[PDB]
A and B are shown apart, each in its own frame.
Chain A
Amino acid sequence: VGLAGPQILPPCRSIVRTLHQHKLGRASWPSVQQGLQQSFLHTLDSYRILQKAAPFDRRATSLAWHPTHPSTVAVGSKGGDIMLWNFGIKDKPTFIKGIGAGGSITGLKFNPLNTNQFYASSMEGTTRLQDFKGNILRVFASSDTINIWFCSLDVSASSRMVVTGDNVGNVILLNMDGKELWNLRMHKKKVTHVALNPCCDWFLATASVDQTVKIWDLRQVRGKASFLYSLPHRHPVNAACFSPDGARLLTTDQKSEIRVYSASQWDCPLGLIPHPHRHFQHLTPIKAAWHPRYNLIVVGRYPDPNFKSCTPYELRTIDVFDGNSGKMMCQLYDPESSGISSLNEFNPMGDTLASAMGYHILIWSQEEARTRK
């Protein structure tokens, strides 16, 4: 704690010379990545000028980035209403509605193949794959009985698999063309998040309300909790998201905690980042996220008068921590946006951040550049 704030300064040592040191071969790459992480933090304290705002109807539930292009993003609502929006285009972005009441989209990834498509998981009970023009291409699975719906979704392209979670305790695993060999139960209650590793292909993670988060091996296990690993918790878990590199698993709870688990001995943790993201009914649950090219963490803060704050000033803001250390390095804040940043996601590109607040979508790029003739 400390080292940065509304008053305290971000920048540590002025090691930029190291780049040329790297040109000489003396200093190693990870130190350089450390220094440029430092650089990005420094310029991130000038992301403060909120670039753009965007509304739509009732509530935000999920966020996703167009992988190839920076300025494009997809977002999913409380009422099955999807939006696709590009910046610097001004062509009044594209919309698609749904039922509006009980059709809450809850998971959303782009199509790795056809950029004009998208996968989606819906409160209707239909993990679907559908176009931005409205035509549904294919349903993949189904509840076939209302009051039992899906909550979690993710996909991998290198392995060509799809995975999805229910509201009771069972997970389903499909191919990109159907062909289901799964639907064995994994948990006792709702599965809030679930994800696949990108750098391997064949161990999986799932998290649930059961105060437990579980790591599976989708080709080797078939025996209904003949799993690979199981990590316990003190409270439930809202999200468990992998690294891009594959070695650092991040986990984020409902009461007050963040945990970093490592490749090395999944059971024990490396470090605890205490920070409040308290759960609540009408709020959208909070989802920590990695930044694809550093060892940073980005989170939304939701103050708690009962959480033992180390810092005396507790505002509604976006915090930025270091992965492999434990403490903080930056805090984004801007009034006129005193809502609670439920979701936050960086680009795969590295120059942009999106925030999903209640009834609001925010874009945080830098501005105020010099000019040409």
Chain B
Amino acid sequence: MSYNYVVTAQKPTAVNGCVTGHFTSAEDLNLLIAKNTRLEIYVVTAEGLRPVKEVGMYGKIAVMELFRPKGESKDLLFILTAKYNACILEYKQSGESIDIITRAHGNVQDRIGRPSETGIIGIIDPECRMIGLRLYDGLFKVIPLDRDNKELKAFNIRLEELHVIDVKFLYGCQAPTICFVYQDPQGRHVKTYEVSLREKEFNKGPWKQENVEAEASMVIAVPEPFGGAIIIGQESITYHNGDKYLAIAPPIIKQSTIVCHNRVDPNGSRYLLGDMEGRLFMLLLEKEEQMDGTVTLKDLRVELLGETSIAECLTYLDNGVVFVGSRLGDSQLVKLNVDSNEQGSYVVAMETFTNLGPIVDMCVVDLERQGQGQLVTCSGAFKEGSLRIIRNGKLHIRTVPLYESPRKICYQEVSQCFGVLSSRIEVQDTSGGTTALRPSASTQALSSSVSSSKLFSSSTAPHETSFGEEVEVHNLLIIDQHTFEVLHAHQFLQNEYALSLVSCKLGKDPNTYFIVGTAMVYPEEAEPKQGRIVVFQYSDGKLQTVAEKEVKGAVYSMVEFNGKLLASINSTVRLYEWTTEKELRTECNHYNNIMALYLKTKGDFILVGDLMRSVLLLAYKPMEGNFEEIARDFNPNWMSAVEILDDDNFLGAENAFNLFVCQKDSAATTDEERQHLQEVGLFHLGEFVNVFCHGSLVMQNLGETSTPTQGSVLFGTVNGMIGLVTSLSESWYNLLLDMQNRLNKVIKSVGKIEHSFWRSFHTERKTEPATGFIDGDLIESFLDISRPKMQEVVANLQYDDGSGMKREATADDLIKVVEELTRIH
């Protein structure tokens, strides 16, 4: 009875991986980029990047590596998805028709296994003898690269070391050899193993185990003539090869963790290093000659090159240019110069590529024109953090740099501004409190108002701070809707984090307030036990504290409720009334929760999203003044977000990247049965949803009756993808889903992955086919195939055109349908 349609409005922008090689031709230098479902293929030019191809895969790319077996004139590509579909692909071009051929494909899922902590790791032997995968603890999977292994058949080897940090195949070994860093009760160590295919087992490696730094975190396989391996830690960089040992401890790198690396020279003489603060270093290997013609390592050196966006990955292209792929900020092309500029930097930005991710919160406002909705998102994190303003007409994006991490947003029409929760990092200063790493919005406001609140400053046991602890400083910014200048910044107390924010009227009071829920943070508490709700009023460019309410827990969420304030505190959902004397009074409470993170409301009904009790449907009783548990989803789901579609339909998203739709049990004959929500819809989105919100970007056609879908809920993701969910009738649902089946019979899936498998519900507990959800992206893909393929798709189809009786469907009819559908986003 609930039928839903999901569609991409903006494809994901974050980069999960990027590599260089020769894929489109033996002569071309190509750049391959992964954005979570999309594979982008560019040619490197003297000026920049030429787009050659963009494809979608039915899967989340976790590994992306190029390789050239013997007999191949150019590189092949290995891809592995999050659902452990593996495929080897080849680029094919003929005229202007470009095809990626599937050379090999297979599912390498084992029956059993716990996925590891550091995630899927995938590497390929330099000699193209084998692929190695770290999927589960204690195991190393090997796909022998035989030409007949078109199914990618594999075997497992035991790893005695169960907690592997990183691993790489080595260069210059007569036998395939892996080197890896692992953790055990004695600390961190580095070790190697040879890989015997004959025995399908490890053999003793060429050099003995050595202890490494406690935070040894990355391995770099150095090519010949160097060979050996480099181990990157938090304070030191070491190199190991046989009897060769060389370690350095440059202080410059201790301030921030190195997180990605890339080789600059083919012989391994230089490497790039990227940290969490966006700093880019040059790592230099000094050669030492040997009388036998071999080369040993003489020295290691680190050189600060400059600052970039915070890099998930780096790739040297050519001519001193590097691509900086970020997930937390925009990606970039940067030029490295041999000589520094005035500020001592060797870095010059060449080009920037929009990244919306992470979208942690957003809202829709008719910023410019009534009925023209625009989406304002809190985007980015630390020095990359921004606001992003998005409108249709494909899309125009305005960027407001904040230089600090946003957390929440709301809009306040009557003040013509936005309230924005934000946070910055500070480190202990020379003599005093803490100091900021750079200027940012909370430190560059036109005016500021530190919290002079002393609600519980008295009779409150302070908790002590030792030298060395870094701090997060949270602020509420008030920002102009037109200029997006930081108008005001209110700094909260030491150690208190602001979590939720709403702007609303309350009770019979005509003033409009900004309301914030917070939590006291202390290092030893399994959960916060102290927090505040704080009601401010904005006037004269500042916030004045009108009221506070102390509570024993973290105010995770708040929502306006019929002029009252509903708020989630630790395992409770609490309603407060606004009295005439302007104070918060507890109206009512509900308790059957572990940790209530998310709330949404409609009418007198409340939908609660739980940390562990996935969803709960509550009702307020005006003639009784209390809550009743109406129903619950008794299937466990670790939620990340929830939404109300309507009075009868409840949407949820969970941490294993799926969506579900709950309803009341229509076929319930008892109050007990009536209390069971039924998960009637299931869909694997492939994204981590952080927020839903009602609204639309497409101009609304006032009085447009007889459309396919009804309602519109936008949602935002970690990868910066934005999508739209809308409602369907039963007949439309049937139509488009049959269309999906036949499209699946016609469409060529990259890597020979089935659409059904990809959208299939999937958690560590259960696997079930999709239901109740139309893959809108797949439907829109109808419009891009050739006409004969459309005719095949619509072959033997009974179709109800407009209102009437059934007849044979023609391609143009379905084109019309899908074109109307594309205009909802």
Point out residues on A near B: beta carbons under 8 Å. Answer: 10-14, 16-17, 19-20, 22-26, 28-33, 36, 38-43, 68-70, 86, 89, 197, 199-200, 203, 244-248, 262-265, 270, 292-293, 348-351, 369-373
B442 interfacial by beta-carbon distance below 8 Å: no
Contacts of B718 in A (CB 8 A): 23-25
Q: Of all chain A residues, which has the CB nearest B572?
A: A370
B405, B676, B690, most chain A CB atoms within 10 A: B690
Q: Is the pair A373, B527 in contact by a Cβ cutoff of 8 Å?
A: no
Instruction: Give Cα distance in the complex from A373 to B523, angstroms.
Output: 35
Q: Identify the closest chain A residue to B626 (Cβ).
A: A372
Q: Are A14 and B521 in contact (CB under 8 A)?
A: yes
4 smallest A-B Cβ distances: which pairs?
A11-B526, A264-B138, A42-B526, A372-B588
A351 to B612, CA, bound (A): 9
Query: Which residues in A have their C-beta under 8 angstroms from that of B690?
Result: 23
- Interface centre among B499, B554, B764, by most A CB within 10 Å? B764
Contacts of A371 in B (CB 8 A): 589
Do B589 and A372 have beta carbons less than 8 Å apart?
A: yes
- Smallest CB separation, A31 vs chain B (Å): 7
- State A248–B162 Cα separation when bound (angstroms): 14
The answer on a CB contact under 8 Å between B655 and A32 is yes
List B contacts of A17 (CB < 8 A): 497, 521
Q: Is the CB of B655 within 8 A of A11?
A: no
Closest to A38 in B: B526
A293, B594: Cα distance in complex, Å: 14
Q: Which residue of A lies closest to B497 (CB)?
A: A17
Complex Cα spacing A10 to B524, Å: 11
List 14 additional contacts besides A20-B499, A350-B613, A370-B589; criterion CB under 8 Å.
A14-B523, A16-B526, A25-B14, A25-B328, A36-B611, A69-B634, A86-B672, A200-B112, A247-B114, A263-B113, A264-B137, A293-B765, A350-B636, A372-B589
B165: Cβ under 8 A from any A Cβ: no
B650 at the interface (CB under 8 A from A): no
A30 contacts B117, C-beta separation under 8 Å: yes
Provide the main secondary structure of the chain B interface: loop
Which residues does chain B contribute within 8 Å of A197, judged by CB atoms?
112
Q: Is the CB of A372 within 8 A of B627?
A: yes
Given contacts A293-B636, A372-B626, contact A351 B613 (CB under 8 A): yes
Q: Could you list some 19 contacts between A and B, CB below 8 A?
A: A11-B526, A14-B525, A14-B527, A16-B528, A19-B611, A22-B640, A22-B655, A23-B718, A25-B14, A25-B327, A26-B381, A69-B634, A197-B112, A203-B111, A245-B112, A247-B112, A265-B138, A351-B594, A369-B591
**Pair A263/B136 contact, Cβ less than 8 Å:** yes
Cβ of B158 within 8 Å of any chain A Cβ, yes or no, is yes
A-B contact count (CB 8 A): 159
Contact residues in B for A11 (Cβ distance below 8 Å): 524-526
Q: Name the residue of chain B whose CB is nearest to the CB of A201.
A: B111
Q: Counting CB contacts under 8 A, is B176 at the interface?
A: no
- Taking a contact as CB atoms closer than 8 A, the residue among B594, B597, B688 that contacts A19 in the complex is B597
- When distances are taken between beta carbons in the complex, the residues of chain A under 8 Å from B764 are 245
The proximity string for B residues 114-126 relative to A, scoring 1 for CB distances below 8 Å and 0 otherwise, is 1111110000000
B557 CB → nearest A CB, Å: 12
Chain B residues contacting A349 (CB-CB under 8 Å) are 613, 634, 636
Q: How far is it, in angstroms, between the C-alpha of A41 and the C-alpha of B597 when the chains are bound?
A: 19
Q: Given that A29-B655, A247-B114 are known contacts, is A14 also in contact with B524, CB under 8 Å in the complex?
A: yes
Contact status B112-A14, CB under 8 Å: no
The CB with the most chain B CB atoms within 10 A, among A10, A32, A263, is that of A263
B228: which A residues are within 8 A, CB to CB? none
* B632 closest partner in A (C-beta): A70
Q: For B429, list chain A residues within 8 Å (CB).
A: none
- B positions within 8 Å CB-CB of A: 14, 110-119, 136-139, 156, 158-159, 162, 327-328, 357-358, 360, 381, 405, 407, 497, 499, 521-528, 554, 571-572, 586-592, 594-595, 597, 611-613, 625-627, 634, 636, 638, 640, 655-656, 672, 676, 688, 690, 718-719, 764-765
A17 to B525, CA, bound (A): 11
- Closest Cβ of chain A to B495, distance in Å, is 11
The residue in chain B whose Cβ has the minimal distance to the Cβ of A11 is: B526
Contacts of B597 in A (CB 8 A): 19
Give the distance in Å from the alpha carbon of A293 to the alpha carbon of B639 in the complex: 13
Contact between chains at A263 and B110 (CB < 8 Å): yes
B496 to chain A, nearest CB (A): 12
- Pick from A11, A26, A41 the residue with the most CB of B within 10 Å: A26
Cα–Cα distance between A22 and B640 once the two chains are bound (Å): 9
- Tell me, in angstroms, the Cα distance from A292 to B139 when the chains sit together: 24
Asked if A39 and B527 make an inter-chain contact with CB atoms under 8 angstroms apart, the answer reads: yes
Verify B612–A24 contact, CB threshold 8 A.
no
CB distance from B200 to the nearest CB of A (A): 13
Nearest A residue to B472 via CB reads A17
B525 closest partner in A (C-beta): A14
B634 touches A28 (CB 8 A): no
In the bound complex, what is the Cα–Cα distance between A248 and B638 (angstroms)?
Answer: 21
Measured in the bound complex, the distance between the Cα atoms of B636 and A36 in whole Å is 14
Bound Cα distance A246, B764 (Å) = 9
B591 partner, pick from A22, A31, A245, A370, beta carbons under 8 A: A370
The residue that A264 contacts in the complex, of B14, B117, B136, B554, with Cβ under 8 A, is: B136
- Is A23 a contact partner of B523 (Cβ separation < 8 A)? no
A369 CA to B497 CA, complexed, in Å: 25
- Chain A residues with Cβ below 8 Å from B405 are 24
Known contacts A23-B358, A23-B640, A28 near B112 by CB under 8 Å: no
Residues of chain B with a CB closer than 8 A to A264's CB: 113, 136-139, 156, 158-159
Contacts of A348 in B (CB 8 A): 636
Cα separation A267 to B159 with both chains bound (whole Å): 14
Please report the C-alpha to C-alpha distance between residue A33 and residue B656 in the assembled complex, in whole angstroms. 12
Instruction: Determine the distance from Cα of A25 to Cα of B327 in the docked complex, in whole angstroms.
Output: 9
**B413 CB to nearest chain A CB (Å):** 27
Residues of A within 8 Å of B656, CB to CB, are 29
Specify the chain B residue showing the minimal Cβ separation from A115: B673
Do the beta carbons of B381 and A373 come within 8 Å of each other?
no
- Are A39 and B595 also in contact (CB < 8 A) when A13-B523, A350-B612 are? yes
Residue of A nearest to B407 (CB): A20
Taking the closest CB of chain A, its distance from the CB of B409, in whole angstroms, is: 14
Query: Which residues on the A side are within 8 Å of B655 (C-beta)?
Result: 22, 29, 32
Is there contact, CB below 8 Å, between A263 and B112? Answer: yes
Q: A residues within 8 A CB of B115?
A: 30
Report the minimal beta-carbon distance from B696 to chain A, rounded to whole angstroms. Answer: 24
Please tell me if the beta carbons of A39 and B526 are within 8 angstroms of each other in the complex.
Answer: yes
Contact A373/B117 with A43-B594, A264-B136, A351-B613 known, Cβ cut-off 8 Å: no
Inter-chain contacts of A32 with B (CB < 8 A)? 655
Q: How far is the CA of A264 from the CA of B592 in the complex (A)?
A: 39
Residues on B with C-beta less than 8 A from A203 are 111
CA of A22 to CA of B360, assembled, Å: 10
